C-alpha cells in the first residue's frame, strides 16, 4: 500500500 511492495 504505502510501504515495501504494498
The per-residue DSSP string of 1-6 comes to --STT-
- Contacts by 1-6 with C-beta closer than 8 Å and gap 24+? none
Q: How far apart are CA 2 and CA 6, in angstroms?
A: 6
The cell numbers describing 5, all together, are 511492495
Neighbouring C-alpha atoms within 13 Å toward the C-beta of 4: 1
Measured distance between the N- and C-terminal CA atoms of the chain, rounded to whole angstroms: 4
Question: Beta-carbon neighbour count of residue 5 at 10 Å?
Answer: 4
Amino acid at each position: 500500500r504505502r510501504y515495501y511492495r504494498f
